[PDB]
Design a protein around this motif. Structure first.
Motif, PDB file in Angstrom:
ATOM      1  N   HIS A  22      25.953 -57.047  33.762  1.00 22.89           N
ATOM      2  CA  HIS A  22      26.192 -57.102  35.200  1.00 22.89           C
ATOM      3  C   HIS A  22      27.705 -57.163  35.507  1.00 22.89           C
ATOM      4  O   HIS A  22      28.567 -57.205  34.570  1.00 22.89           O
ATOM      5  CB  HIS A  22      25.439 -58.227  35.864  1.00 22.89           C
ATOM      6  CG  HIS A  22      26.039 -59.594  35.646  1.00 22.89           C
ATOM      7  ND1 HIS A  22      25.791 -60.346  34.527  1.00 22.89           N
ATOM      8  CD2 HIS A  22      26.822 -60.362  36.444  1.00 22.89           C
ATOM      9  CE1 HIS A  22      26.412 -61.507  34.627  1.00 22.89           C
ATOM     10  NE2 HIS A  22      27.039 -61.544  35.786  1.00 22.89           N
ATOM     11  N   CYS A  23      28.008 -57.050  36.787  1.00 24.06           N
ATOM     12  CA  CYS A  23      29.379 -57.165  37.254  1.00 24.06           C
ATOM     13  C   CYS A  23      29.632 -58.611  37.719  1.00 24.06           C
ATOM     14  O   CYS A  23      28.968 -59.106  38.599  1.00 24.06           O
ATOM     15  CB  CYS A  23      29.668 -56.185  38.393  1.00 24.06           C
ATOM     16  SG  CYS A  23      31.484 -56.200  38.825  1.00 24.06           S
ATOM     17  N   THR A  24      30.588 -59.284  37.098  1.00 23.57           N
ATOM     18  CA  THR A  24      30.776 -60.725  37.306  1.00 23.57           C
ATOM     19  C   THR A  24      30.801 -61.151  38.767  1.00 23.57           C
ATOM     20  O   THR A  24      30.051 -62.000  39.109  1.00 23.57           O
ATOM     21  CB  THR A  24      31.983 -61.201  36.574  1.00 23.57           C
ATOM     22  OG1 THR A  24      31.826 -60.908  35.212  1.00 23.57           O
ATOM     23  CG2 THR A  24      32.222 -62.710  36.696  1.00 23.57           C
ATOM     24  N   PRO A  25      31.625 -60.531  39.641  1.00 26.54           N
ATOM     25  CA  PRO A  25      31.508 -60.844  41.063  1.00 26.54           C
ATOM     26  C   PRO A  25      30.320 -60.215  41.761  1.00 26.54           C
ATOM     27  O   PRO A  25      29.989 -60.651  42.850  1.00 26.54           O
ATOM     28  CB  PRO A  25      32.751 -60.209  41.646  1.00 26.54           C
ATOM     29  CG  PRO A  25      33.053 -59.081  40.756  1.00 26.54           C
ATOM     30  CD  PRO A  25      32.723 -59.576  39.407  1.00 26.54           C
ATOM     31  N   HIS A  26      29.689 -59.182  41.178  1.00 22.03           N
ATOM     32  CA  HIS A  26      28.602 -58.520  41.895  1.00 22.03           C
ATOM     33  C   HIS A  26      27.317 -58.565  41.082  1.00 22.03           C
ATOM     34  O   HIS A  26      26.970 -57.544  40.523  1.00 22.03           O
ATOM     35  CB  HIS A  26      28.956 -57.028  42.180  1.00 22.03           C
ATOM     36  CG  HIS A  26      30.377 -56.773  42.583  1.00 22.03           C
ATOM     37  ND1 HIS A  26      31.144 -55.733  42.035  1.00 22.03           N
ATOM     38  CD2 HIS A  26      31.167 -57.429  43.475  1.00 22.03           C
ATOM     39  CE1 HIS A  26      32.358 -55.819  42.571  1.00 22.03           C
ATOM     40  NE2 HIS A  26      32.400 -56.847  43.420  1.00 22.03           N
ATOM     41  N   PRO A  27      26.606 -59.729  40.979  1.00 25.52           N
ATOM     42  CA  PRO A  27      25.372 -59.809  40.094  1.00 25.52           C
ATOM     43  C   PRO A  27      24.312 -58.706  40.296  1.00 25.52           C
ATOM     44  O   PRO A  27      23.481 -58.471  39.408  1.00 25.52           O
ATOM     45  CB  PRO A  27      24.718 -61.120  40.523  1.00 25.52           C
ATOM     46  CG  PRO A  27      25.841 -61.966  41.051  1.00 25.52           C
ATOM     47  CD  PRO A  27      26.847 -61.017  41.675  1.00 25.52           C
ATOM     48  N   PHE A  28      24.296 -58.153  41.508  1.00 26.48           N
ATOM     49  CA  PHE A  28      23.430 -57.042  41.942  1.00 26.48           C
ATOM     50  C   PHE A  28      23.750 -55.669  41.308  1.00 26.48           C
ATOM     51  O   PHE A  28      22.941 -54.717  41.370  1.00 26.48           O
ATOM     52  CB  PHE A  28      23.513 -56.946  43.465  1.00 26.48           C
ATOM     53  CG  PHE A  28      24.865 -56.501  43.992  1.00 26.48           C
ATOM     54  CD1 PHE A  28      25.163 -55.126  44.147  1.00 26.48           C
ATOM     55  CD2 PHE A  28      25.834 -57.452  44.380  1.00 26.48           C
ATOM     56  CE1 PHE A  28      26.429 -54.731  44.648  1.00 26.48           C
ATOM     57  CE2 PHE A  28      27.086 -57.068  44.867  1.00 26.48           C
ATOM     58  CZ  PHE A  28      27.392 -55.735  45.011  1.00 26.48           C
ATOM     59  N   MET A  29      24.946 -55.546  40.746  1.00 24.43           N
ATOM     60  CA  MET A  29      25.278 -54.445  39.938  1.00 24.43           C
ATOM     61  C   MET A  29      24.782 -54.822  38.539  1.00 24.43           C
ATOM     62  O   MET A  29      25.323 -55.733  37.908  1.00 24.43           O
ATOM     63  CB  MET A  29      26.790 -54.213  39.967  1.00 24.43           C
ATOM     64  CG  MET A  29      27.342 -53.795  41.337  1.00 24.43           C
ATOM     65  SD  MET A  29      29.097 -53.294  41.320  1.00 24.43           S
ATOM     66  CE  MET A  29      29.328 -52.076  40.014  1.00 24.43           C
ATOM     67  N   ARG A  30      23.765 -54.108  38.068  1.00 22.28           N
ATOM     68  CA  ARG A  30      23.131 -54.357  36.775  1.00 22.28           C
ATOM     69  C   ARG A  30      22.971 -53.086  35.936  1.00 22.28           C
ATOM     70  O   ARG A  30      22.634 -51.991  36.437  1.00 22.28           O
ATOM     71  CB  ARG A  30      21.798 -55.070  36.925  1.00 22.28           C
ATOM     72  CG  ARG A  30      21.766 -56.348  37.769  1.00 22.28           C
ATOM     73  CD  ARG A  30      20.328 -56.828  37.759  1.00 22.28           C
ATOM     74  NE  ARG A  30      19.764 -57.295  39.035  1.00 22.28           N
ATOM     75  CZ  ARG A  30      19.579 -56.587  40.158  1.00 22.28           C
ATOM     76  NH1 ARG A  30      19.952 -55.325  40.272  1.00 22.28           N
ATOM     77  NH2 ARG A  30      19.049 -57.180  41.215  1.00 22.28           N
TER      78      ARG A  30
ATOM     79  N   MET B 251      37.582 -51.080  44.726  1.00 21.95           N
ATOM     80  CA  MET B 251      36.846 -52.312  44.390  1.00 21.95           C
ATOM     81  C   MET B 251      36.891 -52.599  42.872  1.00 21.95           C
ATOM     82  O   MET B 251      36.423 -51.763  42.049  1.00 21.95           O
ATOM     83  CB  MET B 251      35.391 -52.219  44.912  1.00 21.95           C
ATOM     84  CG  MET B 251      34.581 -53.492  44.813  1.00 21.95           C
ATOM     85  SD  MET B 251      35.352 -54.930  45.566  1.00 21.95           S
ATOM     86  CE  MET B 251      34.972 -54.723  47.312  1.00 21.95           C
ATOM     87  N   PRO B 252      37.524 -53.715  42.469  1.00 21.75           N
ATOM     88  CA  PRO B 252      37.529 -54.041  40.991  1.00 21.75           C
ATOM     89  C   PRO B 252      36.114 -54.369  40.422  1.00 21.75           C
ATOM     90  O   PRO B 252      35.254 -54.918  41.135  1.00 21.75           O
ATOM     91  CB  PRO B 252      38.512 -55.240  40.866  1.00 21.75           C
ATOM     92  CG  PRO B 252      39.298 -55.162  42.140  1.00 21.75           C
ATOM     93  CD  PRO B 252      38.353 -54.663  43.238  1.00 21.75           C
ATOM     94  N   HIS B 253      35.859 -53.926  39.203  1.00 19.15           N
ATOM     95  CA  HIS B 253      34.520 -54.142  38.616  1.00 19.15           C
ATOM     96  C   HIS B 253      34.625 -54.439  37.186  1.00 19.15           C
ATOM     97  O   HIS B 253      35.622 -54.077  36.550  1.00 19.15           O
ATOM     98  CB  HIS B 253      33.632 -52.871  38.725  1.00 19.15           C
ATOM     99  CG  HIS B 253      33.331 -52.413  40.128  1.00 19.15           C
ATOM    100  ND1 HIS B 253      32.587 -53.151  41.008  1.00 19.15           N
ATOM    101  CD2 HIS B 253      33.565 -51.232  40.750  1.00 19.15           C
ATOM    102  CE1 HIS B 253      32.409 -52.476  42.129  1.00 19.15           C
ATOM    103  NE2 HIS B 253      32.992 -51.305  41.994  1.00 19.15           N
ATOM    104  N   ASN B 254      33.585 -55.040  36.609  1.00 19.39           N
ATOM    105  CA  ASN B 254      33.569 -55.129  35.137  1.00 19.39           C
ATOM    106  C   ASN B 254      32.214 -54.956  34.530  1.00 19.39           C
ATOM    107  O   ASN B 254      31.286 -54.672  35.230  1.00 19.39           O
ATOM    108  CB  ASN B 254      34.286 -56.414  34.598  1.00 19.39           C
ATOM    109  CG  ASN B 254      33.455 -57.688  34.814  1.00 19.39           C
ATOM    110  OD1 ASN B 254      32.595 -57.702  35.685  1.00 19.39           O
ATOM    111  ND2 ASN B 254      33.764 -58.791  34.048  1.00 19.39           N
ATOM    112  N   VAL B 255      32.129 -55.102  33.216  1.00 22.02           N
ATOM    113  CA  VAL B 255      30.860 -55.268  32.527  1.00 22.02           C
ATOM    114  C   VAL B 255      30.814 -56.653  31.876  1.00 22.02           C
ATOM    115  O   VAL B 255      31.674 -56.960  31.062  1.00 22.02           O
ATOM    116  CB  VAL B 255      30.581 -54.142  31.485  1.00 22.02           C
ATOM    117  CG1 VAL B 255      30.319 -52.786  32.238  1.00 22.02           C
ATOM    118  CG2 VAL B 255      31.751 -53.954  30.477  1.00 22.02           C
TER     119      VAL B 255
HETATM  120 CU   LIG Z   1      31.450 -54.885  40.496  1.00 22.83          CU
END
Ligand SMILES: [Cu+2]
Ligand SMILES: [Cu+2]
Lengths: 125, 105, 382, 381, 125, 105
Positions: free
Chosen positions: B91-99, B51-55
């Motif tokens: 947060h993670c741009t596609p995943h706002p719930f990742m904080r 799963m791709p992620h960022n900050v």
């Molecule tokens: Cu993410």
């Protein structure tokens, strides 16, 4: 075609809705509006966020993670419309959910839906 | 501003020196919700999953502009050096719930 | 949905390219494309979308039959394309709440490779004429530095937009005339109620100088809303409802009336043949030929699609060909290069059919062109 | 060509127009008003396959007559007051069609003149742009507050005072989704972890958010379109296989009912699954659950369905199964005494109106835009 | 459904395009949007100006003058599209020209096309 | 504003006078395109053909708003009372080629 039958990938035509990378596309194929399989049409803004899905490539037997990044800041292309859902989850699993306008990160805060591209991130897992 | 970016692009996990402030990413979560670091410290996020992620820090957090980090594929990493004391959300741009939060002391 | 041949082969060579990349381990690196450089076989298709509040233009490579881009517009925009390929533009209209609220009329100029807007020029007081799209109701001057657009209400006028300085200039009062055929930075012709043309010539300031010609047709002879005009040739080609064709030669900046010509024979007319559709006529400059959409039809069916194109020598006008098109065709145009393509757009099929102009043979097609595509525009780059 | 109700309606209208002229009574054109909002008024929303501008159809469910239309922007969220006093939507426009400056706003419309009576801008573009889910934007039971969901930059729920015609504020909320209001100051959402949130908010300050127990496993997928009767306080949540989760919230707290299957074991092994858009309806007077279903692969779950099963909510007993006669995407019902069933086909761009008890097709309304997907009813009586 | 055939009026269905008053209608029939034959749908703005044509009533065999005024301030209804051009003249004869958006004098300056109404304003011959 | 309106919306031709100051409309023309009148005078337009026509005075002619008169069917009339010296141009709303001018002395 029967809408309800198991979706069956091909690796011979990217403008068709059964193209293997399109296993979880929602919207329109960017290749049909001056984009390509993995690139946005001129004038549009490339999202950095997307829903993903592992899709089966019948050519090499491998599964790849496809990132459904939208191209944004244009009215819907209205060309080559598709809606597939292989592994697609509801909205509380947004990471795999495809009704969402995946425009976040696009230049100029473009949030309108034009079309979707089908690039490989990487693999199997 | 409040941070410098050591590398514009993501780089390979293998690259990250042995004593190093690392945030792992796995199972749709940052490893720490809140990282405590000193002024002048580098934080490295490492994605361990497919799963791709960022900050992503919103405008006004680390500077005037948003700091939207690059998407990291499995086994890629991304660094920020924090140059001012403060608390900085992300947060993670596609995943706002990742904080997450960086607390710089 | 349901692919054309061109689509299949492009889709197939695309799937083969992409498979080869994957087998080479080449990472997908998404980016934003540029369109290929404008060339003689680039064709633009404007979709007025049967009066919809928002509209689309499709940028097409006619050689490949491929969509290479698109531009959004507002309500009933007027597109124009620079002959030299340096830019495209439109006069467009938007509303603060879809189709109500505050109206803004504006000109946008676009880079023809990135398709990015390079100018956005607001037009004061909402002066555009909201009408089904007639190409010559908005027009570029020959150096492209200026765009002219028509106002119908509250009085006839022509707005002058300075494209070069990105500024609205002024409204010109003009007679009870319609359409705009520029011949220079400050001269253009229009067509009047009484059946004359008006020549309109305008200074930096002040009222323009107007020069009418003779009446060139009777009041019971109807000149279509879509004449063909070659700015480079200065050739105005104007059919009536019966396919009689008025040619006016504007190349000297003064109307020379050319001999009238019938596109349809005497026997064809007795048999019910008449022009019909939207852009009924095209003119190829180098070949000096006229193309007209014709069918057998009743006389008040003059907006319906036609199944045939007659091609005639403009100088003589000897019939050169008559083609059976194989589709319900509303609009035609041609590319302006040596061995032209003949473009045939069906509003009902939402499909551009691309034909060899010489033989009339269908070569390829491009479908899914919006909701009611009507207008085809090409650059004459030669 | 036409329907069917539309010919008989266009001929009735043509007789009476030839009668006005045979009497020499002049045409005096003006602007009509819709009939008063009744139990069978239906709204059909056309998200137009993500087009920048969209349309709502206001329909006479009884006559099968378009009584009006509301324009919208990009992916707007329609709401209809249960008590029939107004309709509203949260909508999005842009200064240059699909680009330039974004404006998110709420418009409230008079249900008979169809005129806007408030236009309420939302600061900072907070609407969640997603294929249209009715419970992403939601009225409080007292009807003076609109609540909408924000996904990005962080989950939040926006609070719009319709009474005062002013945006109030954004509520920070946890990694949950959807908005089911229970009190003028309280509403529930569903969470990534599997729980529910209870959010009770109060003019200023943190809202009071409590958690429920996780009520489904991580590998049980609860659809984007659960049916919700705010009056009854029942939230019917189908899974991708037919299992129904019900939560009773009519007491301002969550009482999960015993789990129910809408498919026999036989059907599930025979390939049967629920699929489409608005797959589940729930009737309130009659404690019924209607579920669009058909034979399919597991992951063909947005495709249209040709069957609807009926079932009693307390028992889990099959009461009925109708052959719908079309490709159907979206089902709803009127909430009145003998109820209409609604069968929206996105492909035909047609709303089929079915007799609720027999399952029989009664009439049709076609030309409903480009991609109609979302059926809304006012629960009046 | 021979588009090129002579017009044939009928006086039994106002939502079909061959209904006798719609002889030079361009757009959509207002009755299919919550208007009626001679009235605008709720929420729309009634134009005052318009194009005209004379239409033959096969019922009492007279011609009557139709004023095709538009209901405005809404996107095109998209229901019951028709285009008839009985007596339709080019734009330089605007009185009888039907491509023009006939929305002038509408309340609130509404200029967007929703649908056309077919009221009788008298009689030619 | 610079004049006032008798009827707001138009009336039968009959209701006239006789020797009332009138402008007939026929054959796509205002039949007196330069009427000279005096302050307080009431000009009546009368529509003589089946084709609807009106009179339309732009913004800043009769006062700050434009007077967009209502359409007169065959043999309806409409009037306006002029109340100040000056020249007032008008035109018909669907037919902007039909122009007139009331000169008030
Ligand atoms: Cu993410
Ligand atoms: Cu007039």
């Amino acid at each position: 075609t029967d809408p309800r039958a198991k979706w069956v990938p091909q690796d011979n035509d990217i403008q068709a809705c059964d193209y293997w990378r399109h296993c979880s596309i929602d919207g329109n194929i960017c290749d049909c509006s001056g984009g390509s399989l993995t690139n946005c049409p001129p004038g549009t803004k490339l999202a950095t966020a997307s829903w993903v899905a592992s899709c089966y490539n019948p050519t090499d037997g491998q599964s790849y993670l496809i990132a459904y990044r939208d191209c944004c800041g244009y009215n819907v292309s209205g060309r080559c419309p598709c809606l597939n859902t292989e592994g697609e989850l509801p909205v509380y699993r947004p990471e795999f959910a495809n009704d969402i306008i995946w425009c976040f990160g696009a230049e100029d805060d473009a949030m309108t839906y034009h079309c979707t591209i089908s690039p490989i991130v990487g693999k199997a897992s | 501003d409040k941070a410098t970016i050591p590398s514009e692009s993501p780089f390979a996990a293998a690259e990250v020196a042995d004593g190093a402030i690392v945030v792992d990413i796995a199972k749709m979560k940052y490893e720490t919700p809140e990282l405590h670091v000193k002024v002048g410290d580098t934080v490295t996020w490492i994605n361990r999953e497919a799963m791709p992620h960022n900050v992503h820090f919103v405008a006004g957090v680390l500077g005037e502009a948003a700091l939207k980090g690059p998407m990291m594929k499995k086994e890629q990493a991304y660094s920020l050096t924090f140059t001012e004391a403060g608390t900085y959300d992300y947060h993670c741009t596609p995943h706002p719930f990742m904080r997450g939060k960086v607390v710089v002391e | 949905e349901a692919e054309t041949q061109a689509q299949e082969t492009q889709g197939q060579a695309a799937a083969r390219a992409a498979a080869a990349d994957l087998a080479a381990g080449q990472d997908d690196e998404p980016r934003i494309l540029e369109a290929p450089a404008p060339d003689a076989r680039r064709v633009y298709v404007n979709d007025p979308a049967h009066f919809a509040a928002v509209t689309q233009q499709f940028v097409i490579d006619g050689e490949a039959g491929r969509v290479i881009g698109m531009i959004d517009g507002g309500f009933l925009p007027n597109p124009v394309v620079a002959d030299d390929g340096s830019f495209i533009a439109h006069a467009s209209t938007v509303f603060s709440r879809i189709a109500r609220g505050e109206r803004t009329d504006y000109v946008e100029v676009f880079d023809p490779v990135t398709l990015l807007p390079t100018a956005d020029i607001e037009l004061p007081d909402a002066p555009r004429f909201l009408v089904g799209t007639y190409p010559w109701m908005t027009s570029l001057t020959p150096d492209g530095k200026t765009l002219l657009f028509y106002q119908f209400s509250p009085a006839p006028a022509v707005g002058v937009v300075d494209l070069e300085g990105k500024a609205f200039k002024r409204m010109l009062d003009v007679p009870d005339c319609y359409h705009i055929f520029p011949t220079a930075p400050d001269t253009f012709f229009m067509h009047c109620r009484d059946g004359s043309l008006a020549k309109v010539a305008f200074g930096t300031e002040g009222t323009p100088e107007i020069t009418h010609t003779e009446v060139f047709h009777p009041e019971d002879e109807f000149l279509i809303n879509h004449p063909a005009y070659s700015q480079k040739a200065g050739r105005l080609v104007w059919p009536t409802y019966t396919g009689k064709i008025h040619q006016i030669d504007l190349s000297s900046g003064d109307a020379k009336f050319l001999p009238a010509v019938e596109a349809l024979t005497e026997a064809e007319r007795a048999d019910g043949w008449r022009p019909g559709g939207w852009q009924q006529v095209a003119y190829h400059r180098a070949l000096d030929r006229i193309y007209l959409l014709v069918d057998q039809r009743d006389e008040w069916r003059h907006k319906t699609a036609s199944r045939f194109v007659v091609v005639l020598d403009a100088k003589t006008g000897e019939r050169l060909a008559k083609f059976e098109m194989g589709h319900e065709i509303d609009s035609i145009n041609v590319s302006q290069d040596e061995k032209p393509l003949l473009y045939a757009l069906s509003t009902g099929d939402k499909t551009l059919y691309i034909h060899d102009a010489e033989s009339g043979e269908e070569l390829r097609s491009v479908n899914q062109l919006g909701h009611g595509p009507q207008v085809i525009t090409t650059a004459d780059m030669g």
